[PDB]
Amino acid sequence: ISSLWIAKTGLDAQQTNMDVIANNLANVSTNGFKRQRAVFEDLLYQTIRQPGAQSSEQTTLPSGLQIGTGVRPVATERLHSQGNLSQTNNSKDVAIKGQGFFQVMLPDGTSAYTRDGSFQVDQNGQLVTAGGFQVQPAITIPANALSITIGRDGVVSVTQQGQAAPVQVGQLNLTTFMNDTGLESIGENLYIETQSSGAPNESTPGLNGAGLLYQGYVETSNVNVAEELVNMIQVQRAYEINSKAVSTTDQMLQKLTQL
Amino acid sequence: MISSLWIAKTGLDAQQTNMDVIANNLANVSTNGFKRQRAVFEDLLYQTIRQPTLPSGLQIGTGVRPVATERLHSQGNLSQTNNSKDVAIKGQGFFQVMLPDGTSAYTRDGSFQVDQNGQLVTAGGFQVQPAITIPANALSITIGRDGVVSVTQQGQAAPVQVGQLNLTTFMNDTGLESIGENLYIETQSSGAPNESTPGLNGAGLLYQGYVETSNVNVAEELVNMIQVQRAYEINSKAVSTTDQMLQKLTQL
Amino acid sequence: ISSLWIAKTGLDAQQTNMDVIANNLANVSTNGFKRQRAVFEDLLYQTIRQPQTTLPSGLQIGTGVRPVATERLHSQGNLSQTNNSKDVAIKGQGFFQVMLPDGTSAYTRDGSFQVDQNGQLVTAGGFQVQPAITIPANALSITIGRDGVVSVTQQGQAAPVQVGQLNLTTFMNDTGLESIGENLYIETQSSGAPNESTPGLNGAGLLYQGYVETSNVNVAEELVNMIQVQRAYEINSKAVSTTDQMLQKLTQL
Amino acid sequence: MISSLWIAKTGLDAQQTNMDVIANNLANVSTNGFKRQRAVFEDLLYQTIRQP
């Protein structure tokens, strides 16, 4: 019967909404996390019969029967806003202002982009993200580095022992996309290109609409707990309301079949 | 759907942003040349219920929404830093510094330092637009009421002038777009900047050896915090009672 | 089914009452806002049967309750100091006049003014103030006295120069004004034809510079009304429940 | 998880470092040829909900 299918679709939609809300609340501490929001869409409409003639010296209602079909989750759009900055005092942590993505190198050969600023140096001196994946520009910090400094731009330099003038070692260019909402998100805080988001373009920070680099700061997740709690209450109430429809349909079917 | 949940949520958001701006004002109470901020709210759209010279019509509100946030461009106090390269603007005006990318940024916090080349740069590395150059072997640097900056050298009586500090003015001071490091940039809301020598055409004067502090009223801030806390709690109670009513309805 | 319809009407009325209560609570910190209270009324009454000492023995069934209007308490709110120099507050009655983009004219109450790039006086939102006060450059200080006169000083001027006057409008009946969003009211047939006047004349108000008028929302009153609304809703749901029990038993037997 | 909290954290840190430099200045008041230090702060970034 159509009522059960429609209510099943409604319950599934509410469950998916609760799932995305729970995911948003769970990783409230992840660095550089952009909160998601799920948008639904109603299905097609079945027209049992079309309206006839009307408005002929009369005030009659239109006699048109048009049943719904249900609801499906059509998209989950992330909010690429700007989060707050927290100080960590660690010289190898970089916060990004504006737009841009650090490009890392996946083991299989492709490349992924990320916003999480948390960098460490592996055994070879190369700069890698927390997890072992190498940064694609591959900034190399030599040994006996007294202090590694990264300016507001991508230039990174390190002072030696005797020489007063620091020796430059690389540039931390970052990539931008025409539509950051279309990026496909996978684990390890990684975003990859799709057909919906344009081809990435690389630029040094501060140019071509890119951001700026702050040393020793980490961007926090832009989650809104006030929104999340009210959304939880609303989805719980909607779930109960939908279950009431299933209960009533079951009762009326039972009364019918007791014939 | 439920009527009051999405109204109480908007109220909570408004109070949250109010607390955010209050905390931001409180955090930078020790910075130089800072201006306090105030947010202004407004109601949302109203829905009219259609009825069959009546005294009034049936209208239902929808919530609140933060519309704008302005900065109070008043005159702050002055603290004697005892240094000789710190300038405090008395009145209205803005120094013009140049970003590394090439554009121009306008600031008010005057605390200058000299780089290795001899030029005059602000704290952070940006250099002042009129390109003031201080030569080596300088006994002292003096900045008068006007923009003339003079340097005294050993063995000379008459000090030698090195540059001029022309400061810019805007028609709309609040409309400047603010970025970090106490820098502002021009917008459409703010008029086109116009240069001026100090003391003319409404520009302010200069004091050497002083830094302008921030105009933040902690007495107002604390009471505002009390108010926003109480408002947040009341809106939370509204959410709770809406939830209770809706749950009682649905458990029918 | 009559009980179901009546209880549905009661639940809808309580829902609207809770809606207006929440709306009043939400903008408790909005400048120049006036609280609203909703008034309900009964519907038509059915006369099923016309009427030593006994009861009159007549039947007359009710129909339900509908909301009629929401009256705004146009009282006087408190004044809070913002220390700014371009903010004004109304003492008494009167509304400012601003121009909407399409061309019509709408009225506001709160005072929080900025100056656009040209120099004219506009509210926070871009809407231009109708009297069109223009403040030229190098404005060392701006003064808006208890009367509508606005005077700006300049460099080395013995006396300030007047740059206009801020007259404000008054209505015969302000409760009937239609309140569109964004702290604006538009004239309707309910309110009389507005008349503009300088402050302090013909019953108009007075302008205080550097203060804003806070909303007159009574939090204790709203909380008590909210508790009562919740309890009335819980009472009304019992009518639906009992009618459902009656109908179910009737169907079963 | 709140903007007010993450701003007050930075405020506390700034006040702590100001107190630290004051204490360092006061500590070696008897040191020969010592020049006092003072700290200068700046505001962090800004989030633009509506473009001015």
Added chain:
Amino acid sequence: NGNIQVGPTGQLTIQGHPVIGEGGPITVPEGSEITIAADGTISALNPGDPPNTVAPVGRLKLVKAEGNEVQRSDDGLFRLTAEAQAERGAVLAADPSIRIMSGVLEGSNVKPVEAMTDMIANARRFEMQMKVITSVDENEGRANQLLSM
């Protein structure tokens, strides 16, 4: 549904349907920030450019419909009825009396109390009809015995 998305090539859309403004389907610059005015004007600012370079790039088309002359379609987009279409023209005109606001998104309008009352009434009516069916069947079945001899 005010949830407007932007594609890779600067094309505006709503659930895959290109929104049309004054002219044709409006297309903003490639990757610029977009702002909506209080009456439908669209302003674009190329990122990284100074804030004084914000420029209008298009205007939305907003129509006013009373509500009693619009019918839903299969996809879910309301269109004018035949009579209203004949009276007001095939395509409506962008009236300037409508004003909108940005930063907010409108939800749905379904009344839980109405839904619950309708469900209860439907269940009860179904039960009554079933009882009537049973009674009629029993009467006919017992009446057919009269046909015997």
Added chain:
Amino acid sequence: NGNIQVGPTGQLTIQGHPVIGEGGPITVPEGSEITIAADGTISALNPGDP
């Protein structure tokens, strides 16, 4: 139902029904601050007037 309202022309109308007092239903000035006494007297004060 003691909920009185004033129309634009100044007639005390309750729910769209004019109120009746002795000697004519009602008549009040355009915008006077109406103050109703304890036993029925309706004092009116013109706003701004002394």
